[PDB]
Amino acid sequence: PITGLVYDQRMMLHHNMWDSHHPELPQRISRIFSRHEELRLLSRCHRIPARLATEEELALCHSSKHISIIKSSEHMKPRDLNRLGDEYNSIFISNESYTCALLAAGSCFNSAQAILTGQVRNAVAIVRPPGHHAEKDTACGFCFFNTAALTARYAQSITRESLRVLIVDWDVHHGNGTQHIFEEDDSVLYISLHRYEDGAFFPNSEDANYDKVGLGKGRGYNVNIPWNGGKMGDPEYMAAFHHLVMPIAREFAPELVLVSAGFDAARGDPLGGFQVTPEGYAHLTHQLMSLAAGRVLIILEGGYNLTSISESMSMCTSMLLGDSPPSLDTPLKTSATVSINNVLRAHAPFWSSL
Numbered sequence: 001p002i003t004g005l006v007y008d009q010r011m012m013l014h015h016n017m018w019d020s021h022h023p024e025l026p027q028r029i030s031r032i033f034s035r036h037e038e039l040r041l042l043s044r045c046h047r048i049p050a051r052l053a054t055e056e057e058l059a060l061c062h063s064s065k066h067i068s069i070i071k072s073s074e075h076m077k078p079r080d081l082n083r084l085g086d087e088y089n090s091i092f093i094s095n096e097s098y099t100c101a102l103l104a105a106g107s108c109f110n111s112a113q114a115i116l117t118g119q120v121r122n123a124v125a126i127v128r129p130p131g132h133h134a135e136k137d138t139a140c141g142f143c144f145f146n147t148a149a150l151t152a153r154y155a156q157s158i159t160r161e162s163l164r165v166l167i168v169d170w171d172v173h174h175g176n177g178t179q180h181i182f183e184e185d186d187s188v189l190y191i192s193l194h195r196y197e198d199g200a201f202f203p204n205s206e207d208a209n210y211d212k213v214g215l216g217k218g219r220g221y222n223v224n225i226p227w228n229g230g231k232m233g234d235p236e237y238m239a240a241f242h243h244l245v246m247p248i249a250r251e252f253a254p255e256l257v258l259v260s261a262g263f264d265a266a267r268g269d270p271l272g273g274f275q276v277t278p279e280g281y282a283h284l285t286h287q288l289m290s291l292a293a294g295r296v297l298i299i300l301e302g303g304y305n306l307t308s309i310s311e312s313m314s315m316c317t318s319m320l321l322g323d324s325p326p327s328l329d330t331p332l333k334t335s336a337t338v339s340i341n342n343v344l345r346a347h348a349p350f351w352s353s354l
């Protein structure tokens with residue numbers, strides 16, 4: 001009954017040379033790691049080493065063009081770096097960015113491998129830059145390669161091609177890249193909760209609405225839970241898990257659960273505007289460990305209040321280690337009930353549990 005933890009200080013080297021206060025800070029990961037030491041959670045985990053993803057592994061989800069362009073940034077001078085970064089939606093690049101993205105992905109591959117070989121029951125990956133906005137052919141929203149999507153395909157490559165992987169994305173933003181990578185796939189179920197605001201919230205696409213249910217063989221295997229017109233927190237997220245996430249997940253019967261665990265829906269986040277508490281994230285984690293015989297990998301995505309993300313991630317690791325859920329602190333916001341109903345109507349055709 002062992003929990004794995006991966007963290008490597010080298011992933012701090014990716015940085016914004018124009019704006020050293022950009023919120024996707026190197027110290028996001030050192031702060032989370034420090035809080036694990038502070039709470040004496042680190043000694044209770046088995047340390048899994050980081051490694052570099054290979055280019056062949058990157059090609060599980062990304063085009064050779066995209067891999068080659070990001071790879072080449074390793075040797076560019078600033079004017080090439082600033083120019084290339086400005087060509088994407090919301091990207092900064094330094095000479096260390098490619099290596100850090102490789103380390104984030106390889107850290108998660110090693111963690112998924114440790115879970116799938118029975119060396120650990122579950123695991124947490126304290127990694128940056130994040131992944132879930134990265135597309136097959138382009139970088140986006142602080143993300144270069146889609147770490148969680150790559151980990152799903154890597155897991156399939158070391159087990160069987162049709163291994164059922166559930167990705168729960170509770171970052172406050174829609175994981176456009178993860179949805180698109182798996183949109184025609186019935187072997188990877190994507191469930192995202194996200195602030196939507198009728199398309200006005202980053203990444204600003206109606207791709208995030210509830211009626212996008214998957215394409216082709218993937219019809220029914222993309223579940224968008226979009227929030228509008230409300231400061232959502234623990235009540236709304238608990239309800240979404242009770243009515244939608246867990247019934248669908250149990251029916252899917254995943255063999256591996258990956259969490260695209262952004263903590264920017266947290267109370268105090270400067271960007272998300274939501275109020276999920278650390279106890280709330282602990283309860284979401286605890287529910288997901290009832291799936292896949294407990295095989296859960298928690299992957300850091302966004303989250304920009306250093307204190308909030310540190311407390312919130314650590315509480316998730318505490319649940320993975322078997323600690324019992326802390327106690328939650330309210331009637332659902334009206335629009336949250338509407339959102340949950342809309343999703344129930346859109347996915348009841350595909351999931352008899354609804």
Ligand SMILES: O=C(NO)c1c(F)c(F)cc(F)c1F
Pocket residue numbers: 089090130133140141142171173202262264271301302303
């Ligand atoms: O957190 C994020 N995505 O998960 C994110 C992002 F990608 C952006 F481009 C801008 C922004 F303000 C964000 F909070």
Ligand SMILES: [K+]
Pocket residue numbers: 169170171172173174175192193194
């Ligand atoms: K999300």
Ligand SMILES: [K+]
Pocket residue numbers: 182183184185186188189190214218221222
């Ligand atoms: K899918």
Ligand SMILES: [Zn+2]
Pocket residue numbers: 171172173262264301302303
């Ligand atoms: Zn986010």
